Amino acid sequence: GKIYESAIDAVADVQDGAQILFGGFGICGIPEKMINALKQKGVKNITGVSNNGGVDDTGLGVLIKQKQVSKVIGSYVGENTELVRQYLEGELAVELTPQGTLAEKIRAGGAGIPAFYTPTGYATLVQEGGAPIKYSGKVEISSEKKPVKEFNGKNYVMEESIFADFAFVKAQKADPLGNLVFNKAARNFNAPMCRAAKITVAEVEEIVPIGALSPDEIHVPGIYINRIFKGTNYNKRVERLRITPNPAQVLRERIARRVALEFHDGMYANLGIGIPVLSSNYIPKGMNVMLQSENGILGLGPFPTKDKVDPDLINAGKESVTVVPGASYFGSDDSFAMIRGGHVDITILGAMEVSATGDLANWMKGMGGAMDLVAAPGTKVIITMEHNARDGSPKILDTCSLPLTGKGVIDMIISEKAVFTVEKGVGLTLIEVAEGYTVDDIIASTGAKFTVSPNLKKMGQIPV
């Protein structure tokens, strides 16, 4: 470690063309003060490794606004329109990477592991290449094909590590040796990022004396960190405020009241935003379901009351959230290990399209968590979606028209009309139908052929 009274001194040796890691998930745990220091310095032609692009003119967005970034490696850049604007106009390269692969690429880079194998991305544009990175139409740079290799009968994509010139990272406290401690879900990518650069800069809200961070409570050992800055007027906001009639409601609730039935005591689940989250609200009183969030939380609770809103505590959809007793916080690399390693029992997500053989498409915006979640071994994948697209317009097809998130990946599809089970790679089976619908309406709103279960029934609904 070493303490700097001035941020601009801290970035003084940052060269044009530098690869720079930036911590943060959304606007949570972002290195605000060092980003302004870099803005003030006017360094150009940065490859910014960041999970997101902040939003317009916040986080990494501050630097994109000033055209200081020539490429972005990340997983989801939707929320920054200026960034998309530059991508399309051909002013800016964008390499999208599944969020868990991004985390491991960084963790591996800092651990001196130049490449590794992951199941995430297999049979998708990630493995196949061809996705557009840079326009000048014309597509000037598109993604290279990746080597694949099979272990224990499953297929994996080879991925190369990331190790940057600088890492700009945010935390809660430092001691002058550089030992760091993070607060809540603001950890996210800062955890792995601070280990994967030649020079690491940590901004923090408090500097404590040597000793004050006990040895069994330190999250990042000081050896990983070169420079330390204490910022003091942090503009911490929540991006999607959430605090604790009607037919489209009641459809969403039916769907949720159906997935709720898939919960059992002791279960670990990941719920995507929208419908999957809604289903947490219907977990029977006594039953213990620990909900995992890919931004680095185990034990997600309901939205906070007005007085408990914390910008350092959000879910994967950037909503202010709480945690239940027994919650734990961890880094983005640890979060996706949990997942890629198969430790999460069940995953519930939305989709744009779904196929007869279990295919999922819902990133072509960006892919983020979805690819990793559905690629995970021994993990039940349930899709929750509106059966049709408004003009509906089937969403359940024979083959997807869109780029895949995963191939032969889904286990169960639950719409407001119907419940299917999937024999991955083979086909659908209608097993339940909501009251008031008939199998003829389902045949008519479904592009995919399917076999109707002998002994189908009415769609179940959890109590209360």
Contact residues for a copy of itself, defined by CB under 8 A: 1-2, 104, 107-119, 149, 151-152, 154, 156, 160, 175, 177, 179, 181-184, 195-196, 210-211, 213, 215-219, 221-224, 266, 268, 290, 292, 298-299, 323, 325-330, 336-344, 376-377
Question: 150 and 128 in contact (C-beta within 8 Å)?
Answer: no
Shortest Cβ 85–a copy of itself spacing (Å): 34
Output phi, psi for 269, to 5 deg. Answer: -130, 155
* DSSP notation for 54-77: -BTTBTTHHHHHTT-EEEEEESB-
- Smallest gap from Cβ 149 to a copy of itself, in A, equals 7
Which CB atom, from 189 or from 450, has the smaller least distance to a copy of itself? 189
Instruction: Quote the least distance from Cβ 207 to a copy of itself, whole Å.
Output: 13
Give whichever of 80 and 120 is closer to a copy of itself, judged by the CB atom: 120
* Structure tokens given for 376: 């995970």
Q: Which is nearer to a copy of itself, 63 or 298 (CB)?
A: 298
Least Å distance, CB 224 to a copy of itself, is 6
Q: Residue 233: CB partners within 8 Å, gap ≥ 6?
A: none
Given 159, 203, 294, 416, which residue is catalytic?
A: 294
- Cβ proximity to a copy of itself, 344 vs 371, nearer residue: 344
Considering beta carbons, is residue 138 or 149 the nearer one to a copy of itself? Answer: 149
Contacts of 230 (CB under 8 A, 6+ apart): 3, 174, 203, 204, 205, 206, 207
Residue whose CB is less far from a copy of itself, 87 or 182: 182
Asked if 432 is an active-site residue, the reply is no
Q: Are strands 297-300 and 206-207 parallel, antiparallel or unpaired?
A: unpaired
Which letter, b or e, does each residue of 243-267 get, where b requires 16 or more Cβ atoms within 10 Å of its Cβ?
eeeeeeeebbbbbbbbbbbbbeeeb
Contact 312, 29 (CB under 8 A): yes
Q: Is the peptide bond before 246 cis (omega within 30 degrees of 0)?
A: yes
Q: What is the DSSP string of 97-160?
A: --HHHHHHHHHHHHTT--EEEESTTTTSHHHH---EEEE---EEEEPPP--EEEETTEEEEEEE
Identify which of residues 108 and 413 has a Cβ nearer to a copy of itself in the complex. 108
Q: Degrees (nearest 5) of the Cα angle 52, 58, 59?
A: 50
Nearer Cβ to a copy of itself (326/436): 326
* Residue 440 beta carbon to a copy of itself: minimum distance, rounded to whole angstroms: 43
Per-residue tokens: 358: 């279990």
In the complex, minimum distance from the CB of residue 268 to a copy of itself, in angstroms, rounded to a whole number? 5
Min dist. Cβ of residue 179 to a copy of itself (A): 6
Q: Tell the residue number behind the tokens 């509106």, with chain if given.
A: 386
Distance between CA 15 and CA 240 in Å, rounded? 35
Q: Say if CB 276 and CB 348 are below 8 A apart.
A: yes
The 8-class DSSP code of residue 444 comes to H
CB of 457 to a copy of itself, least distance (A): 33
Collect all residues with Cβ–Cβ distance below 8 Å to 343 and sequence separation of at least 6: 268
Which residues form the catalytic set?
Answer: 294
